[PDB]
């Protein structure tokens, strides 16, 4: 990614923010991938809630990553509110993915990414 | 829109929810349009914060409308948290658009739509 | 929606474009709803491809509607290319939803909306 | 990112695809960042078209990256069409960012990322 490079060249120009942006896109892609993999499983009926939570997590992580890419200045912003929402979403998604992690390696990877994004988003709210 | 029609045919099948979904997409489109119109104004330098807030509002309204389109059942969901975030975003965007409404009719229309979406999102959290 | 009202107040200021924008958001919401309803069906395993195509259609319709909301001027734009892609996507999604329409009323509604969006997007490329 | 790891664990389980997905998210974030930086410049009026093209590029790159994250199987997909559209979008955005690269380092970085994403998307269509 180019998050760090672009922040430094912004005319209104932060490690916690760079890490949060990176993780939001990483998590958005991973959740999209996890939902699609759950949809291909023989036992797809067992994974309905996990697919649904992945879909919401991918939507909220993209939104958060976009908002946070525009949060390099000092002006009022929705950033902290959005990051709290992303954190809560990632917490929910992680718990459900974690529950299937013994059965589906893709859900283990997704749960780990959601946990990391949750942590990153919380850290950026400081 | 087909929000009402699709909710009723959902196998896990609410006026406040239908109104919120409709308004989130209406507001997403209106904010996207408002940012683009502000970008075309002679006095674009005066509208920087308004463009930025429109961009964040369009992102959050789409996300909210998507999440709420999947919230027709009884299972745990990020819905209330997301709708509070949308409400707060629309409040911010409305205030800035409102400030330019005497000068730019497109900002008057956008402020009115943001106010309505804010109200709809708050009502759906009940 | 406020598409027509916002186009007329744009400083660079078209019926086919207003109809396309409206339909793209209508279709994005309807496909999101259809995927979520398919995920709740007893026979979810039979609907894997339909869910997947709905997810791609909702993503592409939002993108198209956003791009087209910014296409009110005369400058070079990705608009025609994006609308052709939306048309092709809606065609694919319609065919799969249509196949399940006798079994699931939500897929009948979605197929009808996808057909209309396809038509609208093609008309706006003129 | 976790693109490579998730592809390998997909029940329907490609270097060109992993590179395209990674680049689409990298480019989406970079274009979002570039538009926000152009909005903060003293000479924002000179950057209107660049901001607009960045906004469309961020929208199309996210959509492409999402679609391509679900393209790990053999079934019919919009993937090739979407990747051609992303390529064309990145080409347009690159040319405009490149034009400002002598004046704004953020536009130099964005033009380089758009060029790479364009190349990656074209390579994945093979
Ligand atoms: Cu997750
Ligand atoms: Cu999850
Ligand atoms: Cu997950
Ligand atoms: Cu995850
Ligand atoms: Cu607004
Ligand atoms: Cu606003
Ligand atoms: Cu506005
Ligand atoms: Cu507005
Ligand atoms: Cu469809
Ligand atoms: Cu469909
Ligand atoms: Cu459908
Ligand atoms: Cu449909
Ligand atoms: Cu670009
Ligand atoms: Cu560009
Ligand atoms: Cu750029
Ligand atoms: Cu770029
Ligand atoms: Na900002
Ligand atoms: Na739901
Ligand atoms: Na335009
Ligand atoms: Na697929």
Residue numbers in the entry:
A (entry chain A), B (entry chain A), C (entry chain A), D (entry chain A): 1 to 13, 18 to 130
Give the published text.
The ability of bacteria to maintain appreciable amounts of intracellular copper has only recently been discovered. This organism also possesses a Csp3 (MtCsp3), homologues of which are much more widespread and allow bacteria to accumulate cytosolic copper.
The crystal structure of MtCsp3 plus ca. 2 molar equiv of CuI (see Supporting Information6, 7, 13, 14, 15) has four partially occupied sites. These are Cu11 with an occupancy of 0.25, and Cu12, Cu13, and Cu14, all with occupancies of 0.35, which form a symmetrical tetranuclear cluster. Cu12 and Cu14 are bound by the Cys residues of CXXXC motifs, that is, from the same α‐helix, whilst Cu11 and Cu13 are ligated by Cys residues on different helices (Cu13 is also weakly coordinated by Asn 58). The thiolates of Cys 97, Cys 101, Cys 114, and Cys 118 bridge between two CuI ions (μ2‐S‐Cys). Additional stabilization is provided by CuI–CuI interactions (ca. 2.6–2.7 Å) between neighboring metal ions. There is no preference for CuI binding at a particular tetranuclear cluster apart from in the structure plus ca. 2 equiv, in which only Cu11–Cu14 is occupied. We identify [Cu4(μ2‐S‐Cys)4] as an intermediate for the three clusters that are made up of the first sites (Cu3 to Cu14) to be occupied in MtCsp3.
